[PDB]
Design a protein around this ligand. Structure first.
Ligand SMILES: [Cl-]
Ligand SMILES: [Cl-]
Ligand SMILES: [Cl-]
Ligand SMILES: [Zn+2]
Ligand SMILES: [Zn+2]
Ligand SMILES: [Zn+2]
Ligand SMILES: [Zn+2]
Lengths: 62, 62
């Protein structure tokens, strides 16, 4: 089970990990929506795998 | 912060929550990839919001 999912965004260290960086059928979830959207807007790659960012998904945990 | 992110798949109660159900620019992450992919294969809606499932994203937590 992913025990690190409850830690804050690794970029701003303030908001929760709710900005999923999607590339193909995988995603890296380590940033908040705010931070992740700035990377997409700036045409930056995924911070952990450097693949292109297809979209940011605002991720809820029901 | 999403303290329920580290609980198991609400469907199979055995695998981790790594199957993000994506609809538009939002996602609900409460199931594993295995369970979520069965819903997408059967064209079932999102279990919590009933929107159509565009894709399942295999979600990693770096
Ligand atoms: Cl945010
Ligand atoms: Cl986007
Ligand atoms: Cl899919
Ligand atoms: Zn952030
Ligand atoms: Zn990535
Ligand atoms: Zn499951
Ligand atoms: Zn949903």
């Amino acid at each position: 089970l992913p025990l690190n999912a409850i830690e804050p965004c690794v970029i701003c260290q303030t908001r929760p990990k709710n900005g999923c960086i999607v590339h193909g059928k995988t995603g890296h979830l380590m940033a908040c929506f705010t931070c992740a959207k700035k990377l997409k807007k700036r045409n930056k790659p995924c911070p952990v795998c450097r693949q292109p960012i297809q979209m940011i998904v605002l991720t809820y945990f029901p």
